[PDB]
Each structure stands twice: as C-alpha cells, then as structure tokens.
Amino acid sequence: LAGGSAQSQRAPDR
Amino acid sequence: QVQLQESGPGLVKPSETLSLTCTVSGYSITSDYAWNWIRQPPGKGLEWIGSISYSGITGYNPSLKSRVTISRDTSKNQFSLKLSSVTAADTAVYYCARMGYDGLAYWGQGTLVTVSSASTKGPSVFPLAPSGGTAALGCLVKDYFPEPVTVSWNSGALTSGVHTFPAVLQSSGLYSLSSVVTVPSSSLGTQTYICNVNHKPSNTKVDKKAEPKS
Amino acid sequence: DIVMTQTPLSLSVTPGQPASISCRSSQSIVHSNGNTYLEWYLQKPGQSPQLLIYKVSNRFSGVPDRFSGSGSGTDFTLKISRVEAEDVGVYYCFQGSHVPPTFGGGTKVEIKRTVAAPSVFIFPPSDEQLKSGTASVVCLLNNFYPREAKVQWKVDNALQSGNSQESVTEQDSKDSTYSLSSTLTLSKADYEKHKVYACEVTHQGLSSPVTKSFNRGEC
C-alpha cells in the first residue's frame, strides 16, 4: 500500500 | 541537474542475489519523492519492482515481494535493490527512477543484468575494410558475453552515418555485433577511422582502425 | 493489480499526420484523493523511457505542444497531433493510483514513408580473423524502406542455409529508414576452399535483385 504516486511526496498532493 | 546512475551491467549466477545501486546527484534522496526500481525483460514491457520513499518507507510489487529488498544509503546518496533466488526470468534491463505526483520525471540509463552460469568473456574486434562517392566501413565485435558492448567512432567525434546493429547470439552462445559508418570515398583518404569498443562486464576496451586493405 | 491494455499494438503514420493511442484499465485509476495518476511515456530506441504526460493531460513541457492526453476512469487517449520523424519509438501508459503501479504493454509508433532501395556493401573477413581459423563475411544493407528485405548468401553458386545471422536497426529518428547487417560464418578451411562470395538482396526498391560479391584473393 506504500509505493503509489499519492504517497510519493512529503506535502500532500492537491 | 537531477541525475540518476545505476551500477554497471553483468552476470549473476542463477539462485544467487542480483544486486544493484542507484547513485543520485543534484538532489538529496531524503528531501522528497520516491525512489523506484523498474525492469524490462528482453523484448517485453516495463514492470514496477518497488520503491523507497524520501522517508525510508518501502513498497513492493506483491508478485515479487518475497524475493525483493530495497534500501537507502544516505551517506552515499544511493538506493539499492536486491533480488534473490534469481533465474533466467530475471534477466532484464533494470532502471532506477524518481517518482512524484507529477510522474517519473527522471530515469537512470538502464543496466542489463544477465542471469546465467556462463562465464564472462571479452570481445575480439576485427576491421570491416572500406558509388560513388560514398564508401562503407565498420568493426565486427565478436565472441563476447554477456551484453552489452558499446561502440563509438573516433572517440565520439564521428556520429553521422553510424549504424550499430543489435548483437546476435551465435551458435557458440557468444554474442557478435557489427558497427558501420558510411563516409565519402575521397576522405578514405586523409582521414583515420577508428572504432572504440567498450565491454564493461569484462572491463575490456579496444580500439581498431578500419583501414582499406592492400 | 490493474491491467493497462493499449491499443493498437503498433501504428504507422505519415509525417505531419495525427495519431491516437488508447489505454484502458481493468479498474478505475481514480485515487481516493481525487487525482488520476495516469501518465504517458515514450521510449526511443535504446533509451530510458521519457515522461510526456502526467495526471491525465498535463504536458511534461508545461506548454502547449503536439502531445495531448485525455480520458477518465478506465479509458484514456494519447493524441499526437502532427507526428514527426523524431517521435518514433514505443509509447506506454502508466498508472500510479493503485499499488502496484503498472504500465501498458506499449504501442510501437513508426513513420509511414515512401520506398527507399538499400545500398548494399559486402566485406570479406580480415586477415586478423583468419589467423584464428574462422571467417566472417559481412553484408550491409543501408538506409532502406520498408523494413522487409531478403538477403541470400551464395558461395560458388550455392545458396547458404543455417550458417548466417542478421540484425536490423530500429527506424532512424531522422530519415526513418532501416539498416540491416548479415554475417555468414565459415571455418577458415571452408572459406579457403571457395572462391566467389556473394550476398544477393531483394527489396521493394529493386525491380532487379542486387548482388555484391568479391573473389577470395583479389586486392
């Protein structure tokens, strides 16, 4: 469940 | 400039553990982003192996999870891949890549790992000697294992008219490839044509002149 | 896992004309945060993949250009509005919405163009190679289109089977032609037994088959 694009960066995506 | 650079190509025996590193420059691995491994087996498409985040969190392809380990070595700004119990099915080009919300914007150059018990063997390099007008000449790079070999001409000075063909596996189980270039007959001439051949797996460099025979 | 199915498998397109590639996903690739992590890459011959589009329709360049991405849910399209020689390679869609991230099988894009007949060259084996008891004879077919080409080796009028191998370059990103290399391998003993070595080439270029040859020993 790690490894997705949504998890890739420190700040949340908008 | 963000740049990613995988370790070098070569052999791993079946049942052993494939081991690769990616060294990152122009950016710290712990600043942000996720640091991916992706492979492409010969003539097939791209498979995601897994990643490690800026914060050390790892994610794995469920199909590969029990054989895969990924880590970071922040002291060298590197991240690594180990893939255990390999077979021929794990022979592939392995890529490292940086992922963000906005894509895999940066990739390493790709490193071919061949899974075989066979021995490393370095190439021999033979000239291909040179309407109206334009002559052709080249080098034959023979009897090497595993891939890849790289070829340049006149130390990268000559790139126009160069064709470096895909290698073929000969009946011996060793590779053979040719590299050619078309040039003006008249230069044939005042001008030295030399092929630069590099085989990293065996640490071999050879330069051969492609001269017109007498 | 999410299967990404690309259609078609390959495309031939005349320079300046548009192309369209479809990517369908076996399940939605809308993520819980609302975003759709659908991306397109191009992998040019012998290179790493390069990102073209992210989040469905955002261009990597950041500016209006020939690549356009559209779609939603399970159905996506890449359009290339005016294909150029340089665009040739394999295109992949990719989803990073659900673990594991998965790519499509790829769509190979080639440039449709007019016939070009090959230039043919033959190369005898080097004296250096001969020292070692094997002889390679090489025939080069240069800069031709389409890819389909037939190369026959003849040694003293005998067609050779099962002792040659050939390789073809990828479509050149400039002129959109192919090149082809063929190697005949003999023992030195067999090479020295014979006289006339020829490669005979047939191609849509050529209302007559082109033969290049040499006689072992003339200099």
Tab-separated table of C-alpha atoms in Angstrom:
chain	number	residue	atom	x	y	z
A	1	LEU	CA	0.000	0.000	0.000
A	2	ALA	CA	3.119	2.144	0.046
A	3	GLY	CA	4.569	2.689	-3.443
A	4	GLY	CA	1.705	4.653	-5.046
A	5	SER	CA	2.034	8.105	-6.616
A	6	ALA	CA	-0.174	9.597	-3.886
A	7	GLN	CA	2.384	8.523	-1.272
A	8	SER	CA	5.431	9.704	-3.187
A	9	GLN	CA	5.942	13.184	-1.666
A	10	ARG	CA	6.211	14.970	1.704
A	11	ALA	CA	3.464	17.512	1.234
A	12	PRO	CA	0.064	16.158	0.188
A	13	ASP	CA	-0.831	16.361	-3.496
A	14	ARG	CA	-3.538	18.885	-4.416
B	1	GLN	CA	20.622	18.804	-12.675
B	2	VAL	CA	18.995	15.802	-11.068
B	3	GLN	CA	20.801	12.700	-12.374
B	4	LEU	CA	20.391	9.003	-11.533
B	5	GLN	CA	23.120	6.495	-12.298
B	6	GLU	CA	22.747	2.711	-11.845
B	7	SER	CA	25.717	0.459	-11.211
B	8	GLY	CA	27.210	-1.495	-14.126
B	9	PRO	CA	25.869	-4.439	-16.159
B	10	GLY	CA	26.882	-8.051	-15.826
B	11	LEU	CA	26.271	-11.636	-14.869
B	12	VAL	CA	24.708	-13.141	-11.744
B	13	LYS	CA	24.511	-16.918	-11.409
B	14	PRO	CA	21.093	-18.421	-11.032
B	15	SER	CA	19.980	-18.997	-7.410
B	16	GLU	CA	22.199	-16.106	-6.246
B	17	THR	CA	21.196	-12.497	-5.461
B	18	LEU	CA	21.145	-9.734	-8.040
B	19	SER	CA	22.414	-6.537	-6.501
B	20	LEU	CA	22.177	-3.012	-7.990
B	21	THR	CA	22.679	0.514	-6.730
B	22	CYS	CA	21.438	3.828	-7.971
B	23	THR	CA	23.530	6.900	-7.140
B	24	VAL	CA	21.611	10.217	-7.143
B	25	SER	CA	23.287	13.581	-7.848
B	26	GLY	CA	21.880	17.144	-7.870
B	27	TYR	CA	19.237	16.228	-5.319
B	28	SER	CA	19.150	14.591	-1.874
B	29	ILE	CA	17.174	11.338	-1.643
B	30	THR	CA	15.803	12.414	1.720
B	31	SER	CA	14.429	15.795	0.536
B	32	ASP	CA	11.301	14.374	-1.142
B	33	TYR	CA	9.995	11.890	-3.755
B	34	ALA	CA	10.090	8.127	-4.054
B	35	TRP	CA	12.949	6.141	-5.484
B	36	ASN	CA	11.873	3.467	-7.799
B	37	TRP	CA	13.116	0.246	-9.431
B	38	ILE	CA	11.561	-0.896	-12.726
B	39	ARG	CA	12.774	-3.604	-15.122
B	40	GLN	CA	12.234	-4.544	-18.744
B	41	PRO	CA	12.943	-8.179	-19.692
B	42	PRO	CA	14.239	-8.774	-23.274
B	43	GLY	CA	11.603	-7.675	-25.812
B	44	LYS	CA	8.900	-7.250	-23.140
B	45	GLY	CA	7.351	-4.263	-21.387
B	46	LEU	CA	8.047	-2.492	-18.137
B	47	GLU	CA	7.444	-3.927	-14.673
B	48	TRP	CA	7.489	-1.976	-11.432
B	49	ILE	CA	9.635	-3.761	-8.839
B	50	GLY	CA	9.231	-1.428	-5.886
B	51	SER	CA	10.368	1.826	-4.323
B	52	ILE	CA	11.656	3.544	-1.227
B	53	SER	CA	10.336	6.934	-0.146
B	54	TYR	CA	12.302	10.002	0.989
B	55	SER	CA	11.297	8.894	4.495
B	56	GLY	CA	12.563	5.350	4.181
B	57	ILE	CA	9.142	3.698	3.608
B	58	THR	CA	9.368	0.790	1.113
B	59	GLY	CA	6.668	-0.589	-1.175
B	60	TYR	CA	6.979	-3.722	-3.218
B	61	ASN	CA	5.278	-5.403	-6.175
B	62	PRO	CA	3.209	-8.071	-4.386
B	63	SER	CA	4.300	-10.621	-7.004
B	64	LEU	CA	7.982	-10.041	-6.275
B	65	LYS	CA	7.782	-9.025	-2.623
B	66	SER	CA	9.196	-12.207	-1.121
B	67	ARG	CA	12.369	-12.006	-3.196
B	68	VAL	CA	12.948	-8.215	-3.178
B	69	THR	CA	14.750	-5.888	-0.764
B	70	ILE	CA	15.209	-2.150	-1.278
B	71	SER	CA	17.191	0.164	0.975
B	72	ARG	CA	18.726	3.632	1.112
B	73	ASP	CA	22.331	4.513	1.983
B	74	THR	CA	22.005	8.175	2.773
B	75	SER	CA	25.726	8.521	3.416
B	76	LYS	CA	26.395	7.968	-0.361
B	77	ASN	CA	23.014	9.363	-1.531
B	78	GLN	CA	22.288	5.929	-3.041
B	79	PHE	CA	19.452	3.468	-3.021
B	80	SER	CA	19.753	-0.207	-3.731
B	81	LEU	CA	17.973	-3.256	-4.967
B	82	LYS	CA	18.489	-6.911	-4.089
B	83	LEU	CA	16.634	-9.685	-5.835
B	84	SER	CA	17.228	-13.100	-4.523
B	85	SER	CA	16.929	-16.675	-5.942
B	86	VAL	CA	17.157	-15.444	-9.468
B	87	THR	CA	16.643	-17.361	-12.759
B	88	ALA	CA	16.737	-16.511	-16.499
B	89	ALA	CA	13.318	-14.957	-15.958
B	90	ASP	CA	15.068	-12.139	-14.064
B	91	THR	CA	17.395	-11.279	-16.949
B	92	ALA	CA	16.365	-7.710	-17.839
B	93	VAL	CA	17.324	-4.092	-18.137
B	94	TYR	CA	16.898	-2.596	-14.681
B	95	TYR	CA	16.087	1.140	-14.374
B	96	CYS	CA	16.069	3.456	-11.361
B	97	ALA	CA	13.605	6.371	-11.439
B	98	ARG	CA	12.370	9.244	-9.330
B	99	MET	CA	8.560	9.395	-8.797
B	100	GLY	CA	6.462	12.379	-7.776
B	101	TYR	CA	2.748	13.182	-8.004
B	102	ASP	CA	3.654	14.527	-11.449
B	103	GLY	CA	5.336	11.450	-12.868
B	104	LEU	CA	8.617	9.533	-13.249
B	105	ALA	CA	10.361	12.621	-14.400
B	106	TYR	CA	13.916	11.341	-14.084
B	107	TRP	CA	15.369	7.932	-15.008
B	108	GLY	CA	18.718	6.227	-14.827
B	109	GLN	CA	20.260	4.979	-18.066
B	110	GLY	CA	19.292	1.317	-17.545
B	111	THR	CA	21.586	-1.572	-16.657
B	112	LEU	CA	21.370	-5.022	-18.251
B	113	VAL	CA	21.735	-7.873	-15.786
B	114	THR	CA	22.051	-11.334	-17.339
B	115	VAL	CA	21.224	-14.346	-15.095
B	116	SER	CA	23.473	-17.235	-16.260
B	117	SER	CA	26.082	-19.740	-15.039
B	118	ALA	CA	28.036	-18.972	-18.211
B	119	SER	CA	31.411	-17.166	-17.945
B	120	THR	CA	32.196	-13.542	-18.731
B	121	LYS	CA	34.150	-13.298	-21.942
B	122	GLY	CA	35.557	-10.180	-23.611
B	123	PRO	CA	35.229	-9.399	-27.358
B	124	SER	CA	37.633	-9.648	-30.300
B	125	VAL	CA	37.491	-6.737	-32.699
B	126	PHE	CA	38.023	-7.106	-36.441
B	127	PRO	CA	38.029	-4.459	-39.152
B	128	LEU	CA	35.431	-4.264	-41.868
B	129	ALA	CA	37.605	-2.725	-44.589
B	130	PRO	CA	36.373	0.093	-46.862
B	131	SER	CA	29.072	4.539	-55.596
B	132	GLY	CA	30.401	6.986	-55.879
B	133	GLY	CA	31.131	8.736	-53.795
B	134	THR	CA	30.341	7.030	-50.502
B	135	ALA	CA	32.244	4.084	-49.020
B	136	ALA	CA	31.151	1.940	-46.058
B	137	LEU	CA	33.407	0.657	-43.265
B	138	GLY	CA	32.988	-0.779	-39.777
B	139	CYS	CA	34.052	-3.065	-36.946
B	140	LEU	CA	32.961	-6.600	-36.147
B	141	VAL	CA	32.808	-7.195	-32.388
B	142	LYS	CA	32.829	-10.924	-31.861
B	143	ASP	CA	32.636	-13.645	-29.254
B	144	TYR	CA	31.665	-11.846	-26.053
B	145	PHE	CA	29.306	-12.497	-23.106
B	146	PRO	CA	27.225	-11.098	-21.666
B	147	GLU	CA	25.814	-7.961	-23.297
B	148	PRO	CA	26.207	-5.077	-23.652
B	149	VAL	CA	29.048	-3.718	-25.684
B	150	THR	CA	29.236	-0.012	-26.632
B	151	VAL	CA	30.762	1.334	-29.826
B	152	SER	CA	31.857	4.823	-30.798
B	153	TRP	CA	33.872	6.143	-33.767
B	154	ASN	CA	36.873	8.468	-33.483
B	155	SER	CA	36.140	8.833	-29.777
B	156	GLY	CA	32.605	10.140	-30.358
B	157	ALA	CA	33.827	12.703	-32.892
B	158	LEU	CA	32.055	10.706	-35.648
B	159	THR	CA	28.318	10.104	-35.290
B	160	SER	CA	26.823	10.955	-38.676
B	161	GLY	CA	26.202	7.829	-40.799
B	162	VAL	CA	26.983	5.389	-37.954
B	163	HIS	CA	24.874	2.284	-37.516
B	164	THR	CA	25.484	-0.039	-34.615
B	165	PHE	CA	23.383	-3.169	-35.026
B	166	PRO	CA	21.698	-5.317	-32.329
B	167	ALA	CA	24.053	-8.157	-31.297
B	168	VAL	CA	23.295	-11.764	-32.293
B	169	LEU	CA	23.856	-14.773	-30.120
B	170	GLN	CA	25.975	-17.163	-32.177
B	171	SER	CA	25.779	-20.956	-32.059
B	172	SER	CA	28.660	-20.837	-29.594
B	173	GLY	CA	26.448	-18.960	-27.079
B	174	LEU	CA	28.658	-15.865	-27.509
B	175	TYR	CA	27.428	-12.560	-28.945
B	176	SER	CA	28.568	-10.888	-32.175
B	177	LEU	CA	27.689	-7.415	-33.418
B	178	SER	CA	28.788	-5.042	-36.091
B	179	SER	CA	29.068	-1.282	-36.251
B	180	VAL	CA	29.313	0.512	-39.577
B	181	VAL	CA	29.610	4.027	-40.922
B	182	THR	CA	29.223	5.472	-44.435
B	183	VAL	CA	31.786	8.134	-45.391
B	184	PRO	CA	32.993	9.907	-48.568
B	185	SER	CA	35.314	7.690	-50.639
B	186	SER	CA	37.671	10.638	-51.044
B	187	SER	CA	38.272	11.020	-47.300
B	188	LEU	CA	39.373	7.413	-47.386
B	189	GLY	CA	41.664	9.293	-47.709
B	190	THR	CA	43.230	11.887	-45.431
B	191	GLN	CA	41.232	10.547	-42.525
B	192	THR	CA	41.687	7.823	-39.887
B	193	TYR	CA	38.592	5.832	-38.963
B	194	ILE	CA	38.798	4.088	-35.592
B	195	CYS	CA	36.144	2.238	-33.653
B	196	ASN	CA	36.054	2.458	-29.867
B	197	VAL	CA	34.713	-0.708	-28.282
B	198	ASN	CA	33.878	-0.982	-24.603
B	199	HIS	CA	32.768	-4.177	-22.822
B	200	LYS	CA	32.102	-3.239	-19.177
B	201	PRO	CA	31.309	-6.736	-17.852
B	202	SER	CA	34.843	-7.862	-18.667
B	203	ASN	CA	36.464	-4.461	-18.355
B	204	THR	CA	37.629	-4.531	-21.978
B	205	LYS	CA	38.432	-1.520	-24.163
B	206	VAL	CA	39.744	-1.985	-27.700
B	207	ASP	CA	40.338	0.461	-30.498
B	208	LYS	CA	40.622	-0.891	-34.026
B	209	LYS	CA	41.451	1.014	-37.201
B	210	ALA	CA	39.170	0.252	-40.146
B	211	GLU	CA	41.715	0.639	-42.956
B	212	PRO	CA	41.324	-0.178	-46.673
B	213	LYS	CA	43.360	-3.328	-47.393
B	214	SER	CA	46.146	-3.544	-49.989
C	1	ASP	CA	-3.418	-5.440	-9.963
C	2	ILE	CA	-4.552	-3.063	-12.625
C	3	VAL	CA	-4.044	-4.245	-16.169
C	4	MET	CA	-3.358	-1.482	-18.656
C	5	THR	CA	-4.312	-2.562	-22.182
C	6	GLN	CA	-3.032	-0.395	-25.006
C	7	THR	CA	-4.491	-0.317	-28.488
C	8	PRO	CA	-3.289	-0.602	-31.091
C	9	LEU	CA	-0.125	-2.661	-30.703
C	10	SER	CA	1.544	-0.686	-33.422
C	11	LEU	CA	0.922	2.217	-35.748
C	12	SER	CA	2.394	3.521	-38.949
C	13	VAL	CA	1.796	7.208	-39.536
C	14	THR	CA	2.803	9.594	-42.283
C	15	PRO	CA	4.864	12.520	-41.019
C	16	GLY	CA	2.688	15.560	-40.298
C	17	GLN	CA	-0.417	13.446	-39.750
C	18	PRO	CA	-2.037	12.702	-36.359
C	19	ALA	CA	-2.006	9.510	-34.327
C	20	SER	CA	-4.113	8.337	-31.415
C	21	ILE	CA	-3.348	5.649	-28.821
C	22	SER	CA	-5.867	4.234	-26.390
C	23	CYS	CA	-5.228	2.895	-22.897
C	24	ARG	CA	-7.939	1.064	-20.994
C	25	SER	CA	-7.527	-0.035	-17.369
C	26	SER	CA	-9.152	-3.125	-15.847
C	27	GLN	CA	-10.276	-0.998	-12.903
C	28	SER	CA	-10.677	2.700	-12.239
C	29	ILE	CA	-7.366	4.602	-11.695
C	30	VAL	CA	-9.123	7.482	-9.913
C	31	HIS	CA	-7.131	7.619	-6.426
C	32	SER	CA	-9.129	8.364	-3.063
C	33	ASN	CA	-7.627	11.922	-3.077
C	34	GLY	CA	-9.499	12.561	-6.404
C	35	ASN	CA	-6.424	12.634	-8.640
C	36	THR	CA	-5.842	10.230	-11.542
C	37	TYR	CA	-2.218	9.276	-11.737
C	38	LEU	CA	-2.255	8.361	-15.386
C	39	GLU	CA	0.935	9.045	-17.216
C	40	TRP	CA	2.345	8.540	-20.751
C	41	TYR	CA	5.989	7.780	-21.619
C	42	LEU	CA	7.944	7.496	-24.838
C	43	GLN	CA	10.842	5.038	-25.045
C	44	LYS	CA	13.056	5.852	-28.026
C	45	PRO	CA	15.328	3.157	-29.467
C	46	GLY	CA	17.911	2.114	-26.869
C	47	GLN	CA	16.957	4.801	-24.334
C	48	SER	CA	15.239	5.165	-20.962
C	49	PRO	CA	11.514	5.986	-21.050
C	50	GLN	CA	10.756	9.753	-21.007
C	51	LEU	CA	7.740	11.305	-19.437
C	52	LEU	CA	5.292	13.056	-21.814
C	53	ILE	CA	2.051	13.499	-19.877
C	54	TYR	CA	1.126	13.262	-16.165
C	55	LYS	CA	-2.152	13.460	-14.284
C	56	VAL	CA	-4.074	12.504	-17.490
C	57	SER	CA	-3.461	15.683	-19.545
C	58	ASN	CA	-0.572	17.758	-18.146
C	59	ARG	CA	2.238	18.130	-20.627
C	60	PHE	CA	5.754	17.456	-19.397
C	61	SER	CA	6.984	20.513	-21.337
C	62	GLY	CA	4.461	22.581	-19.354
C	63	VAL	CA	3.484	24.397	-22.566
C	64	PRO	CA	1.094	23.732	-25.461
C	65	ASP	CA	2.616	21.075	-27.751
C	66	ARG	CA	1.838	18.154	-30.053
C	67	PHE	CA	1.011	15.708	-27.252
C	68	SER	CA	-2.446	15.718	-25.789
C	69	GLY	CA	-3.791	13.385	-23.084
C	70	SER	CA	-7.454	12.916	-22.274
C	71	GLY	CA	-9.891	10.475	-20.648
C	72	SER	CA	-11.165	9.411	-17.203
C	73	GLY	CA	-11.926	6.409	-15.008
C	74	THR	CA	-10.829	3.397	-17.095
C	75	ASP	CA	-10.500	4.965	-20.570
C	76	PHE	CA	-7.643	7.241	-21.744
C	77	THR	CA	-6.231	8.512	-25.013
C	78	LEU	CA	-2.946	9.959	-26.098
C	79	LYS	CA	-3.100	12.071	-29.253
C	80	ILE	CA	-0.123	13.198	-31.254
C	81	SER	CA	-1.338	15.964	-33.479
C	82	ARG	CA	1.382	16.088	-36.163
C	83	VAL	CA	3.752	13.132	-35.944
C	84	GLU	CA	7.405	13.822	-36.772
C	85	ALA	CA	10.347	11.550	-37.549
C	86	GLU	CA	11.694	12.133	-34.041
C	87	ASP	CA	8.530	10.754	-32.356
C	88	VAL	CA	9.247	7.146	-33.364
C	89	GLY	CA	9.528	4.614	-30.528
C	90	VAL	CA	7.298	2.762	-28.097
C	91	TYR	CA	4.633	4.642	-26.091
C	92	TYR	CA	3.499	3.358	-22.678
C	93	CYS	CA	0.675	4.417	-20.462
C	94	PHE	CA	1.210	4.006	-16.720
C	95	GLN	CA	-0.920	4.195	-13.597
C	96	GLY	CA	0.356	5.028	-10.108
C	97	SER	CA	-3.068	5.314	-8.445
C	98	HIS	CA	-3.143	1.762	-7.036
C	99	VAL	CA	-0.299	-0.466	-5.842
C	100	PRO	CA	1.480	-1.963	-7.683
C	101	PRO	CA	1.952	0.773	-10.290
C	102	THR	CA	1.566	-0.878	-13.711
C	103	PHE	CA	2.433	0.003	-17.299
C	104	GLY	CA	0.586	-0.783	-20.519
C	105	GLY	CA	2.067	-3.278	-22.947
C	106	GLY	CA	3.239	-0.449	-25.233
C	107	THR	CA	2.260	0.790	-28.693
C	108	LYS	CA	5.047	0.896	-31.240
C	109	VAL	CA	4.833	4.048	-33.416
C	110	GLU	CA	6.573	4.033	-36.790
C	111	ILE	CA	6.791	6.602	-39.553
C	112	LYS	CA	4.993	5.605	-42.772
C	113	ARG	CA	7.070	6.797	-45.697
C	114	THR	CA	7.980	6.208	-49.332
C	115	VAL	CA	10.143	3.361	-50.716
C	116	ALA	CA	13.944	3.581	-50.488
C	117	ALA	CA	16.126	0.869	-52.019
C	118	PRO	CA	19.101	-0.276	-49.935
C	119	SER	CA	22.700	0.497	-50.666
C	120	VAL	CA	24.494	-2.866	-50.436
C	121	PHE	CA	28.113	-3.431	-49.321
C	122	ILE	CA	29.989	-6.708	-48.848
C	123	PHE	CA	33.012	-7.119	-46.501
C	124	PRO	CA	35.489	-10.046	-46.676
C	125	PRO	CA	36.952	-11.499	-43.493
C	126	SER	CA	40.007	-9.688	-42.045
C	127	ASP	CA	43.422	-11.336	-42.246
C	128	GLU	CA	43.438	-10.955	-38.457
C	129	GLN	CA	40.296	-13.074	-38.040
C	130	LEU	CA	41.584	-15.675	-40.488
C	131	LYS	CA	44.663	-16.280	-38.302
C	132	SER	CA	42.238	-17.750	-35.780
C	133	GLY	CA	40.509	-20.287	-38.053
C	134	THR	CA	37.139	-18.641	-38.542
C	135	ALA	CA	35.914	-16.443	-41.329
C	136	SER	CA	33.087	-13.926	-41.028
C	137	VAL	CA	31.714	-12.431	-44.208
C	138	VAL	CA	29.528	-9.341	-43.700
C	139	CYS	CA	26.847	-7.849	-45.981
C	140	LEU	CA	25.415	-4.404	-45.114
C	141	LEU	CA	22.037	-3.177	-46.400
C	142	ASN	CA	21.923	0.549	-45.782
C	143	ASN	CA	19.110	3.024	-45.407
C	144	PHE	CA	16.088	1.351	-46.938
C	145	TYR	CA	12.306	1.308	-46.548
C	146	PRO	CA	10.165	-0.564	-45.888
C	147	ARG	CA	11.782	-2.938	-43.417
C	148	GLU	CA	11.016	-6.122	-45.350
C	149	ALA	CA	14.186	-7.258	-47.129
C	150	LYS	CA	15.568	-10.594	-48.261
C	151	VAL	CA	19.285	-11.370	-48.113
C	152	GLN	CA	20.697	-14.523	-49.681
C	153	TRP	CA	24.261	-15.725	-49.325
C	154	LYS	CA	25.839	-17.600	-52.241
C	155	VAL	CA	29.246	-19.277	-52.175
C	156	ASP	CA	30.405	-20.522	-55.622
C	157	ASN	CA	26.755	-20.551	-56.824
C	158	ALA	CA	25.443	-22.438	-53.791
C	159	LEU	CA	22.740	-20.808	-51.622
C	160	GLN	CA	23.793	-20.901	-47.929
C	161	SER	CA	21.374	-22.046	-45.227
C	162	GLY	CA	21.617	-22.215	-41.470
C	163	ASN	CA	25.041	-20.531	-41.289
C	164	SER	CA	24.173	-16.817	-41.346
C	165	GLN	CA	22.546	-14.424	-38.872
C	166	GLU	CA	21.194	-10.920	-39.332
C	167	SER	CA	20.145	-7.888	-37.222
C	168	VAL	CA	18.136	-4.814	-38.228
C	169	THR	CA	18.474	-1.320	-36.736
C	170	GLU	CA	15.416	0.486	-35.379
C	171	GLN	CA	13.760	3.149	-37.519
C	172	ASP	CA	16.195	6.017	-37.717
C	173	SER	CA	14.759	9.051	-35.913
C	174	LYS	CA	15.901	11.380	-38.773
C	175	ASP	CA	15.319	9.722	-42.188
C	176	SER	CA	13.005	6.966	-40.935
C	177	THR	CA	14.916	4.216	-42.791
C	178	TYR	CA	16.222	0.834	-41.573
C	179	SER	CA	19.630	-0.755	-41.975
C	180	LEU	CA	20.431	-4.475	-41.941
C	181	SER	CA	23.589	-6.454	-41.195
C	182	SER	CA	24.095	-10.137	-42.110
C	183	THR	CA	27.022	-12.337	-41.148
C	184	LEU	CA	27.944	-15.567	-42.957
C	185	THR	CA	30.182	-17.669	-40.686
C	186	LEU	CA	32.506	-20.363	-42.146
C	187	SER	CA	35.553	-22.225	-40.895
C	188	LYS	CA	38.777	-20.890	-42.380
C	189	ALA	CA	39.218	-24.222	-44.158
C	190	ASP	CA	35.806	-23.892	-45.830
C	191	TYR	CA	36.405	-20.232	-46.702
C	192	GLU	CA	39.749	-21.034	-48.401
C	193	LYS	CA	38.136	-23.918	-50.327
C	194	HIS	CA	35.898	-21.474	-52.227
C	195	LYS	CA	36.204	-18.579	-54.490
C	196	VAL	CA	33.168	-16.413	-55.096
C	197	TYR	CA	31.282	-14.893	-52.113
C	198	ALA	CA	28.036	-13.019	-52.787
C	199	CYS	CA	25.121	-11.500	-50.958
C	200	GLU	CA	22.027	-11.159	-53.075
C	201	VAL	CA	19.407	-8.623	-51.934
C	202	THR	CA	15.741	-8.354	-52.829
C	203	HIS	CA	13.560	-5.398	-51.806
C	204	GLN	CA	10.552	-3.406	-52.956
C	205	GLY	CA	13.097	-0.832	-54.055
C	206	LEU	CA	14.535	-3.103	-56.676
C	207	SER	CA	12.947	-4.231	-59.932
C	208	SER	CA	16.039	-6.492	-60.120
C	209	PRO	CA	17.918	-8.251	-57.242
C	210	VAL	CA	21.224	-6.566	-56.327
C	211	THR	CA	24.309	-8.744	-55.930
C	212	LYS	CA	27.549	-7.620	-54.351
C	213	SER	CA	30.440	-10.020	-54.400
C	214	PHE	CA	34.186	-10.499	-54.067
C	215	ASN	CA	36.595	-13.263	-55.092
C	216	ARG	CA	38.756	-14.552	-52.247
C	217	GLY	CA	42.249	-13.229	-53.018
C	218	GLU	CA	41.849	-10.214	-55.341
C	219	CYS	CA	43.251	-6.992	-53.864
